[PDB]
Design an enzyme around this catalytic site. Structure first.
Site, PDB file in Angstrom:
ATOM      1  N   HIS A 148       3.796 -16.810  -9.680  1.00  0.00           N
ATOM      2  CA  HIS A 148       4.242 -15.465 -10.009  1.00  0.00           C
ATOM      3  C   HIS A 148       4.185 -15.256 -11.515  1.00  0.00           C
ATOM      4  CE1 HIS A 148       6.472 -14.457  -6.026  1.00  0.00           C
ATOM      5  NE2 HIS A 148       5.320 -15.070  -5.819  1.00  0.00           N
TER       6      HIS A 148
ATOM      7  N   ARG B 186      -0.561 -16.474   2.299  1.00  0.00           N
ATOM      8  CA  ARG B 186       0.188 -15.237   2.490  1.00  0.00           C
ATOM      9  C   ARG B 186      -0.752 -14.044   2.541  1.00  0.00           C
ATOM     10  NH1 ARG B 186       4.634 -12.359  -1.409  1.00  0.00           N
ATOM     11  NH2 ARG B 186       2.669 -11.979  -2.538  1.00  0.00           N
TER      12      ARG B 186
ATOM     13  N   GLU C  24      11.087  -8.179   2.945  1.00  0.00           N
ATOM     14  CA  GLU C  24      11.423  -8.006   1.539  1.00  0.00           C
ATOM     15  C   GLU C  24      12.066  -6.665   1.230  1.00  0.00           C
ATOM     16  OE1 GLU C  24       8.227  -9.117  -1.229  1.00  0.00           O
ATOM     17  OE2 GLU C  24       9.848 -10.162  -2.294  1.00  0.00           O
TER      18      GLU C  24
ATOM     19  N   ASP D 131      12.233  -7.303  -4.184  1.00  0.00           N
ATOM     20  CA  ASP D 131      12.148  -5.863  -3.963  1.00  0.00           C
ATOM     21  C   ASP D 131      13.433  -5.254  -3.409  1.00  0.00           C
ATOM     22  OD1 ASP D 131       9.527  -5.829  -4.880  1.00  0.00           O
ATOM     23  OD2 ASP D 131       8.645  -5.892  -2.876  1.00  0.00           O
TER      24      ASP D 131
ATOM     25  N   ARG E  26      13.773 -16.335  -3.915  1.00  0.00           N
ATOM     26  CA  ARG E  26      14.537 -16.063  -5.127  1.00  0.00           C
ATOM     27  C   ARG E  26      13.669 -16.170  -6.370  1.00  0.00           C
ATOM     28  NH1 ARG E  26      18.137 -20.037  -2.835  1.00  0.00           N
ATOM     29  NH2 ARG E  26      19.903 -19.049  -1.752  1.00  0.00           N
TER      30      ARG E  26
ATOM     31  N   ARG F 134       5.832  -3.424  -9.459  1.00  0.00           N
ATOM     32  CA  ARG F 134       6.313  -4.742  -9.082  1.00  0.00           C
ATOM     33  C   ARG F 134       7.709  -4.967  -9.652  1.00  0.00           C
ATOM     34  NH1 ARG F 134       1.704  -6.923  -6.011  1.00  0.00           N
ATOM     35  NH2 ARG F 134      -0.141  -5.891  -6.900  1.00  0.00           N
TER      36      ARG F 134
END
Lengths: 890, 890
Positions: B126, B405, B515, B552, B590, B715
């Protein structure tokens, strides 16, 4: 503090073989303690009576026990030494201070003398390493544990985990078979050799160099030692020395050379990515910018997915990474080429894609250093980049340069085969003059000598094929060609011609070996005769190396006469080299034991005649000594320090040159000492017999240490071994008795002159002090017991004669030094093993105890024993243990 | 003690840019000190006036300076922490003692609960790691230097060489371009990922495990944790997560998987020879003896010269070495096969010659362990052999299992393409019931679905081809298939069918991602509906994993309402899993920042509802956090300890379950808090505008951190980033004001109930304490200055409204905790950068300062800047520095 190890080990031993065996071991330890304390010779028999009861396997366990107790003692010794010396918060900084204060020498003199100083340490596979490598590793781990324990920052859990580690590692040590069941191959010897690099030397060299930089900065010299200044180097004989070792074939030399090359490539490659990561600057000079633009021009916009880090094309934002990136690609292709060359017979890797030059590697790194200094980044340059430069300039593309050794008569055999095949005579039958003339005519000549159709023995083809193997490989993989039993120049010219004729593109330097006493007496003459040859002096280009053997000199004559003729020899060789304006470097074939010219390094360096080194020294490191001086960061460092300091001091602080009275006194003393020595070791007709009975010489070959398959005809190594095991050390001190006594008898003021010499002539002082050391490690009661148990009633007094001379000689030794810290205790252990070694020998040389699947207990470990099942293992265990206890094999 | 770093750094900075720049930096430091001390808002303008004078390059140098000063502060923080904690001579041993004393739990309960406990740490790429790797290395070296300095056993020369090293390494840090000039590839992200293994994790895991063994022995449990007990594992998303990242292609996943496989092979191979050396015992049981005889039967009497150690055929004298020797040959052939598979497209290495099973590797090692224990060598077995067993059983043949994913709608697109091509309808237009029915019929069916001739978009072929890529590779290289925006069972059944139809031999487990807040409210229902399907519950075999997003949730609604709905969600999911007798493991997405569900690990674990973990926990480690918790042996250890301790305690010491009054109180409070949050972030029509002016959100994309090319549509990462940079933290505390005030207004005893909840409900306590932390790291004067410099005169009071709420909310927060160590100083630095960040933004959004070879100075580093030459670099430098100072990016 000492009782710690005893406690832990005896506890583990009880966990492994029961209370009974721990109690009997304790009984032995106490009896030996009473011997090394009270020294009643009855105590030895009192212990032997306890020993004769053991079961076949139980005695094996006992010998194992005291052996490992001794080894543990050595390790604790090394740790306590490193701590006792580290808690100081000769020596390098001390030597600088003494050179400045005492001699008024300047810093820049130290630095400039240091730039031009070289020490070429060559490691040898001489069969003196008693301990098998499989155990030596465990030794390393155990000394690490004891190193971490000896500190006051232990955290509870760390201490407990370290106790579990030390216990489990000791137990792992005890669970290994100590006996090499088959002797190693030369390549195994080279593997044991190189192991110290990718373990200690590889990282040890840069740290030592940084320490030298620190010392020079504490003298006021901000400058740093040049990365290409060759303060230290490494050679090896492992896999090249074929003198009397027919198992070392040409293909063996090939194999070990390709091996070392691949190793070096590997280590450099593992390092190169970390170095690239750090070299992330964006400022550079215009020179390096131009070069980086060159490589990024042919950067090959390709994936390169096999790589881990920097797998993508390297941007010009980070130019050092670009140059180092090409260095990586060439390094990778090198490791892969060598890897295939070794795995199979060939590689498809193109040689241009590899580093072929010792310094096609170095050039880009130098360019990096220059750039960093140009941009004010000298601190950055003196970091990982410097360490890497020094590593390259020190180990090169193949970790060590390998020496090739062979006896003159093999060259003579090849040549005689050539002249016989050419129908021109017999090189053997030819006078030395004829030999020189022909060899010269062919060296200057332009015609092929022999052709494909030359008749060759297996031997002839051995030497020729090792030459072809040298020619096929890169030049920077080899060192020197050493000629054993060299007598005349024809012996060297033979090698030069054989190289040229075997199309050795860059022939290597030829170097003679003078090992026998006569060869040393005649050596300066023969070297002078060699320098007389105008062609060879023209080819040698002002540099010549010559080797000086220490092993065999003190074996056929007295030890004393050996040392004195060695001093004379060094002196006169330097005379010849100076006369012909050729820079001589002398190659000292010293051993680890004093009996083969050994001793503490700085003392044996001080005992060399002054102005004989002058920034060029070469020393053998005989097998066992290697582990003694490179098995730990601390050991490696202390070794490199000791050597470099001794050399620099011997350069700027030349030892005193002897007065003529001392010269002549030593000449007489040497005649009397040699007559004394040969009187007992060769005149006595029964001496060889008594030697083959009272010492464990003959059984040495059972330890399977090395790869090599009268008393004049044995190797010096089992010679000093045999007398060192029994703690008698005859070849160390023999002639000194008659020498000193005759010298004092001839004149009374010779006592005042001896006291004068001991306090002012460094060579003499070193000699007497060493003899005193050897007397300190001796006990004549041992030799008495060996005599009592193995020697026939007849020549019992013969040894006693020697035992007389022993004491008598010792009396004289102290008398010249003016002599009259609480370590002891270890001798107790050693004494026990001595007894074990004696009685067991007696059972081996018997007819009742001679011989006429898996293994689940020690006795099943030796099924092919021509002796009784439990015995051979016990004897070998005794020899190993006693060696480790005396800290010397041979 | 702190002034050390300031002194050294300012000295170096003066050596690099002159006295003048050091003086101006000192001036800034003193002005900021007066602000973080006296807090006069005039001091900020007083500093900005000093800043507006700088030359274009000088300002670059200033931002660089305070950035590196901040980084140095973080490192000194980590070192002082490790020392302050080490000089103690929650916590693991403390947790054992508290579990025994407080709760009366038994040791064997701790051990048995510990055997059945699992923590699956998954590392993610990320885009939250601000610092480029090229600098992170230098950070590592500098913390090593400062670690060695902070000790009282320094030897003079060591201290001087460490000062030279620290200086040269700082200078090397400063000489690197901080700006990623091109964003990385997914594979670069995976490389940054795996770097922590062959650096820290690889050796860090066995040490931690040994420490657990030590703790269990301090409880009286002599037994050791099973090597195959899976107390920890590692997954990765690096190179698999393709949700919204079209740069992650199937071939990318291939590349990173082959990569990891080769890495693992390499590390195992480097280790295996040392392990073979140690395993030199001759005693073994009859089982291992039979096996060793097997391998020595096909030992292949061959050279095997490519090897370094043990190149000769291994004797049966050392049987463990025989078995381990075969393990080496298979390990070598594995590394070589992967090496060619990666370098080229293929390998000639036969798969039988490699380890294909996760435990064809493990079986021989287990056999070794059994043998050692049989012969009384359990201490030996628990040493290097144990460490090696744990390493194999923990990292396997490819260091981490990779997760894949993708969003549901991509699966839906593929299926709709299939039904359209089959002339049977539109899967999109189909009701969820129809979808379930068809998917089920095809999963139980036996006919190929689509054929070679299926029309495929680039997208369709992307998802299909990633499935084929999964099928082509080994199963033990992957973890789970994570479905973003999962709403119904058809979303999971789609993936199961697509796997089966793409001939995925061992299909992997499917796991949904909930999410968005609505998806979390509906999640337990949808999971229940999925478990209803008898076929799927039959295939899941009593184990199911489901992911819970934190990022989110707190972005579209209040942070508070997010946390409370998260607690409810975990609780109800466990309800469903228990009802259907399926072991649930919950995957917690997290972040590092509290705004994305972050916080100190043991606190955020305690804030999970009890009986929701039960020895199975899975947590994301968001990019930047990785460096925070694995860049040092100490950090890695403290991380693994913190996690495992928190889990075990949450298992045996379940946190209190809330009273119903607290439940309903939180429901009301959540309605009011969400209305409060959306009132300002969505109802206000000018809010998006003010956000795009007062925070540095839009410029985030310039830092080139990750590989991914209204406010509801951004985001969460730049969302929390934008408000964290300005030190305002709106998304952390917003709803709490109206929530608490309305709750106290409705009833006065609600204050006594709030005080009750803060001291007895762990979740509520954690929440309020975290909000108090975030308030401690905030300063509203900063947001005031940003408003003053960039926001138009009109909506100035809007922010002030927020600034009102801020203070008001803070007043309430402390009021529930009952509150009213001398670190400070660093905020001074941060404050300076804040000013720099504000004024510079103002110059960027101007028309005069817009734009209408090699590089030898900073200004030449950004030639392609659409803004003024010196500016873009300065802004990026400010964002980097402020992030590092707050110890959080987003």
């Amino acid at each position: 503090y000492d009782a710690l190890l005893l406690d832990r080990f005896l506890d583990i031993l009880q966990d492994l073989h029961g209370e009974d065996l721990r109690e009997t071991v304790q009984e032995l330890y106490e009896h030996s303690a009473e011997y090394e304390g009270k020294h009643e010779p009855k105590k030895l028999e009192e212990l032997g009576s306890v020993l004769t009861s053991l079961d076949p396997g139980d005695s094996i366990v006992i010998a194992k026990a005291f052996s490992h107790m001794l080894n543990l003692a050595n390790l604790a010794e090394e740790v306590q030494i490193a701590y006792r010396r580290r808690i100081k918060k000769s020596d390098l900084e001390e030597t600088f201070k003494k050179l400045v204060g005492d001699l008024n020498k300047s810093p820049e003199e130290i630095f400039d003398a240091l730039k031009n100083q070289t020490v070429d340490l060559v490691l040898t596979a001489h069969p003196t390493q008693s301990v098998r490598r499989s155990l030596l590793q465990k030794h390393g781990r155990i000394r690490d544990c004891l190193a971490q324990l000896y500190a006051k920052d232990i955290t509870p859990d760390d201490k407990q985990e370290l106790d579990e580690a030390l216990q489990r590692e000791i137990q792992a040590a005890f669970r290994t078979d100590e006996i090499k069941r088959t002797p190693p191959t030369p390549q195994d010897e080279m593997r044991a050799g190189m192991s110290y690099f990718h373990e200690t030397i590889w990282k040890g060299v840069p740290k030592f160099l940084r320490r030298v930089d620190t010392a020079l900065k504490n003298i006021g010299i901000e400058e740093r030692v040049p990365y290409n200044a060759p303060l230290i180097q490494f050679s090896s004989w492992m896999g090249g020395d074929r003198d009397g070792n027919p198992r070392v074939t040409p293909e063996v030399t090939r194999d070990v050379c390709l091996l070392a090359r691949m190793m070096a490539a590997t280590m450099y490659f593992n390092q190169i990515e970390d170095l690239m990561f750090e070299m992330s600057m964006w400022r550079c000079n215009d020179e390096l910018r131009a070069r980086a633009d060159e490589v990024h021009a042919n950067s090959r916009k390709d994936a390169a997915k096999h790589y881990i880090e920097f797998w993508k094309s390297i941007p010009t934002t980070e130019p050092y990474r670009v140059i180092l990136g090409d260095v990586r690609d060439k390094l990778y292709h090198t490791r892969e080429r060598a890897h295939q060359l070794l795995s199979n017979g060939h590689s498809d890797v193109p040689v241009e894609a590899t580093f072929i030059n010792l310094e096609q590697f170095l050039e880009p790194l130098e360019l990096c250093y220059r750039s960093l200094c140009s941009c004010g980044d000298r601190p950055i340059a003196d970091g990982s980049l410097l360490d890497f430069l020094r590593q390259v300039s020190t180990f090169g593309l193949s970790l060590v340069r390998l020496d090739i050794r062979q006896e003159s008569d093999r060259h003579t055999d090849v040549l005689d085969a050539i002249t016989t095949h050419l129908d021109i005579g017999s090189y053997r039958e030819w006078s030395e003059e004829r030999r020189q003339e022909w060899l010269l005519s062919e060296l200057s000549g332009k015609r092929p000598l022999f052709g494909s159709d030359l008749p060759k023995t297996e031997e002839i083809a051995d030497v020729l094929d090792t030459f072809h193997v040298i020619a096929e490989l890169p030049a920077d993989s080899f060192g020197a060609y050493i000629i054993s039993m060299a007598t005349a120049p024809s012996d060297v010219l033979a090698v030069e011609l054989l190289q040229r004729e075997c199309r050795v593109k860059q022939p290597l330097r030829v170097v003679p070996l003078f090992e026998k006493l006569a060869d040393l007496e005649a050596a300066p003459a023969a070297v002078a005769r060699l320098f007389s040859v105008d062609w060879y002096k023209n080819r040698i280009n002002g540099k010549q190396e010559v080797m000086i053997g220490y092993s065999d000199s003190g074996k056929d004559a007295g030890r004393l006469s050996a040392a004195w003729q060695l001093y004379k020899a060094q002196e006169e060789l330097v005379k010849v080299a100076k006369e012909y304006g050729v820079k001589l470097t002398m190659f000292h074939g010293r051993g680890g034991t004093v009996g083969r010219g050994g001793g503490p390094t700085h003392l044996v360096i001080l005992s060399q005649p002054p102005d004989t080194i002058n920034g060029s020294l070469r020393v053998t490191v005989q097998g066992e000594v290697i582990e003694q001086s490179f098995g730990e960061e601390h050991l490696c460092f202390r070794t490199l320090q000791r050597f470099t300091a001794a050399t620099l001091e011997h350069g700027m602080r030349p030892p005193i040159s002897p007065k003529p009275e001392w010269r002549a006194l030593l000449d007489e003393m040497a005649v009397v000492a040699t007559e004394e020595y040969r009187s007992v070791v060769f005149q006595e007709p029964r001496f060889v017999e008594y030697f083959r009975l009272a010492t464990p010489e003959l059984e040495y070959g059972r330890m399977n240490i090395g790869s090599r398959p009268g008393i004049e005809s044995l190797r010096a190594i089992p010679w000093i071994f045999a007398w060192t095991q029994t703690r008698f050390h005859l070849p160390v001190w023999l002639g000194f008795g008659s020498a000193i006594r005759h010298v004092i008898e001839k004149d009374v003021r010779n006592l005042h002159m001896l006291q004068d010499m001991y306090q002012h002539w460094p060579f003499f002082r070193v000699t007497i002090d060493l003899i005193e050391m050897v007397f300190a490690k001796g006990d004549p009661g041992i030799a008495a017991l060996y005599d009592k148990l193995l020697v026939s009633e007849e020549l019992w007094p013969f040894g006693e004669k020697l035992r007389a001379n022993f004491e008598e000689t010792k009396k004289l030794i102290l008398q010249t030094a003016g002599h009259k810290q609480r370590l002891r205790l270890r001798d107790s252990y050693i004494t026990t093993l001595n007894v074990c070694q004696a009685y067991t020998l007696k059972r081996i040389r018997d007819p009742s105890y001679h011989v006429t699947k898996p293994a689940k207990e020690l006795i099943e470990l030796n099924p092919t024993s021509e002796y009784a099942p439990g015995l051979e293992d016990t004897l070998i265990l005794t020899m190993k243990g006693i060696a480790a206890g005396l800290q010397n094999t041979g």
